Design a protein around this ligand. Structure first.
Ligand SMILES: Nc1ncnc2c1ncn2[C@@H]1O[C@H](COP(=O)(O)OP(=O)(O)OP(=O)(O)O)[C@@H](O)[C@H]1O
Ligand SMILES: Nc1ncnc2c1ncn2[C@@H]1O[C@H](COP(=O)(O)OP(=O)(O)OP(=O)(O)O)[C@@H](O)[C@H]1O
Ligand SMILES: [Ca+2]
Ligand SMILES: [Ca+2]
Ligand SMILES: [Ca+2]
Ligand SMILES: [Ca+2]
Ligand SMILES: [Ca+2]
Lengths: 311, 311, 311
């Protein structure tokens, strides 16, 4: 899909500057093209005189001009949608998780966000005709609640061997917000090398609540989260992959709202509201979507992952 | 297990800064690595210019990069699970209390949380093949309800001598929420020196109800509790120990819910619902778990600790 | 036993602040040690700059660090247990009322809770070898049901002079919940000057039922009650005295439950269920205890106080 950054070398950009790019997090030409002047100036071995040359060079390699809605529609006819493992959810999402956008799943505890992430980590590897994303998977955990047994269970549910599914998912533990961001640079790098289909951060806001604390650090928290979210969107556009984030909630006291403020609400293309049903089943609700109508679904959690309720 | 903080000394970090670290609560290299920039800047004798040097130095000592799910699965095949002393509970937890996570036991009064803590304080010392954690024990009491006679009774139940079991458990009394936190720094320190297997706080929320009172102090209460819970999780990850917390309940008036709001619900990896049975027996229910299914158990309280009902 | 508050004066704290503390209800170093920052800041003539100095200074006077269970067990071996005047109850209580904890006696009317208090107010003065607390006695009445004649009757039963027993008992009448609280401050002050052994509140919940009324004030009631119960606990730990409270019951309609909700149940270290037997005899039952097994007893009310039944 994406063209490697080394494409700049032969066309008229020499070695020192390009080799200076990657350790700033740019492993693709598109990332350089999508970046403004400011993101190029900051690193040491680059001056403005050649910064504009690099940007102008990267411009002609990737179409960044105006297009008619027709071609975009034809490009959005080929966008892959990853099944969730449940028929109800798939009909609510009209196919499942759409790649190339940021999906947010929020709710109280036990609402099932972790299991959806686990099932997505496996369903992303299915063939396209099976509703799968047909690619690798990346899981970033900020809570230590990654339990591969669920991956094994769902893998066997579709008849996939348990060995390959485990070897074919990327994992990392975020201990603070800063470490939670350096992983995104590895996200860029590794996706250049291998075909990924899904990016998961669980949770994208768990460590932000405590690291940034009080009305004082709120502004800095929002800025850090916004940069986090802009990085993610860049990853989604530069590799065309599904970004699924999990968010926590806070009770409204004056009946619950997701945390993160308006920043995560705007950044998130699609938000899903999760609430408990009866027993193992739970309720999913579309919180935000540009074209999808506001509706509901009835999804269950079984010993073999998210699926359909018996009734 | 964990590497001592003094590992930084020989590799290129001098004495003054390291000796400035420990009194901030950092007695392990991992704690420094897991901490963000902000936690390093706050203390006096450290500047950013060397703060990044310390963090970069600690980075190469502990793997904080991406990993495949296979190796994590192999690491989670060796995780110790501490038996509770009851067969039913062990089958519900598929072995018992999992180390390296935060376990929450909540319920009304007399539900048995104290006796489970007491039995865990002894079962954590058993050999691994006996289902025990094979380590020391730490018990933090916020209610003054620590009665060693129960420790003696359960100790003799397994045939362990009553002398060593008492000498091999750490005790402290928390009188306010602030004192309840300074103990966690001692928790870090002492676990560096001796092999611990279990951390108990009883109760993690008892003193928060009264110290912080009203709709006014609620926000501050939640912030203080969240910091409490992040410290604990850091201890759990930095020593790989079981964190068992006990929580209270409030009747829902509009049939009971644990106190602490969504913060303790999200932070707690696993929550157990306790309710009275008939006579001495009581009922345990899984309230939250990433991979464990929602099921129930029938656990009894005897004169020799938590065990199996006669019927 | 407890150290006087004036101990801070010579150790580096000046007079003005110290004299400001006593009118806030702090008459011992331990109380200052156990209080958090917030309780110090609220008073006018105290600033955070010196508050921390005060807390740190008091910290070195009272051991507030970790300890081994062995020492604590040895400290609990010397804990005084006050006999109840009945062999059955004492065997149920394995010696009698344990000092340093909060014990709750609940039941319907005429269950004898007031009579138990009257007997305790006397037996607390007995020599230790006789099972008595060897200390003074403090009686808080919220109902005006305090009858010294019962004290005289019990006094002569043990052969003590009726004059001294009446002169050695502190009495107070609480007319509303707020008044019910201010007495605790006087309780704190008085117990510093003289050795007390027992604190009795009868009833700890009588005035709360009527002063706060309806679902609206309910939340406020529990808040007010929760604080009340923490002052009590603090008195118990700072003086090592027995705290006995009497609670009413409400019929469960959907066969009775003690009033106060989960708040009083959790705080209550030991709860006793009282129910009438036949004639003058009545039945006691362990409702909650950290260490005692659940069992029953047969205690009788006689013309000379609580005792054993003739049969
Ligand atoms: N193997 C399984 N079979 C059935 N149900 C399961 C299984 N594993 C987990 N569950 C259920 O899935 C639910 C979701 O738990 P989970 O840990 O994912 O919650 P969460 O929404 O991520 O919470 P938090 O914010 O606290 O992390 C729980 O109620 C649990 O009982
Ligand atoms: N030695 C023993 N033998 C049998 N049962 C016992 C023994 N010690 C305590 N129990 C019982 O254990 C039960 C649990 O009491 P416990 O004090 O642990 O309650 P809890 O849930 O911690 O309550 P709280 O929130 O009020 O502290 C009580 O009903 C008590 O009767
Ligand atoms: Ca989760
Ligand atoms: Ca308890
Ligand atoms: Ca949880
Ligand atoms: Ca009465
Ligand atoms: Ca209790």
């Amino acid at each position: 899909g994406p063209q490697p950054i080394s494409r700049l070398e032969q066309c008229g950009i020499n070695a020192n500057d390009v080799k200076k790019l990657e350790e700033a997090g740019f492993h693709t030409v598109e990332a350089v093209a999508y970046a403004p002047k400011k993101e190029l100036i900051n690193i040491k071995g680059i001056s403005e005189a050649k910064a504009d040359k690099i940007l102008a060079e990267a411009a002609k390699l990737v179409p960044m001009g105006f297009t008619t809605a027709t071609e975009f529609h034809q490009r959005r006819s080929e966008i892959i949608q990853i099944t969730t493992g449940s028929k109800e959810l798939d009909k609510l999402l009209q196919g499942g998780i759409e790649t190339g956008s940021i999906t947010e799943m929020f709710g109280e505890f036990r609402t099932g966000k972790t299991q959806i992430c686990h099932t997505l980590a496996v369903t992303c590897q299915l063939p396209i005709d099976r509703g799968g994303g047909e690619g690798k998977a990346m899981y970033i955990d900020t809570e230590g609640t990654f339990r591969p047994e669920r991956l094994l269970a769902v893998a066997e549910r579709y008849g996939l061997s348990g060995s390959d599914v485990l070897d074919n998912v990327a994992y990392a533990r975020a201990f603070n917000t800063d470490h939670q961001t350096q992983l995104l640079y590895q996200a860029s790098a590794m996706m250049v090398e291998s075909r990924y289909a899904l990016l998961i951060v669980d949770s994208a806001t768990a460590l932000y609540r405590t690291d940034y604390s009080g009305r004082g650090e709120l502004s800095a928290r929002q800025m850090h989260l916004a940069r986090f979210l802009r990085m993610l969107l860049r990853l989604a556009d530069e590799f065309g992959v599904a970004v699924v984030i999990t968010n926590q909630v806070v009770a409204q006291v004056d009946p619950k709202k997701p945390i993160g403020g308006n920043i995560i609400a705007h950044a998130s293309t699609t938000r899903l509201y999760l609430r408990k049903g009866r027993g193992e089943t739970r309720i999913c609700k579309i919180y935000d979507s540009p074209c999808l109508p506001e509706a509901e679904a009835m999804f269950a959690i079984n010993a073999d992952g998210v699926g359909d309720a018996k009734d």
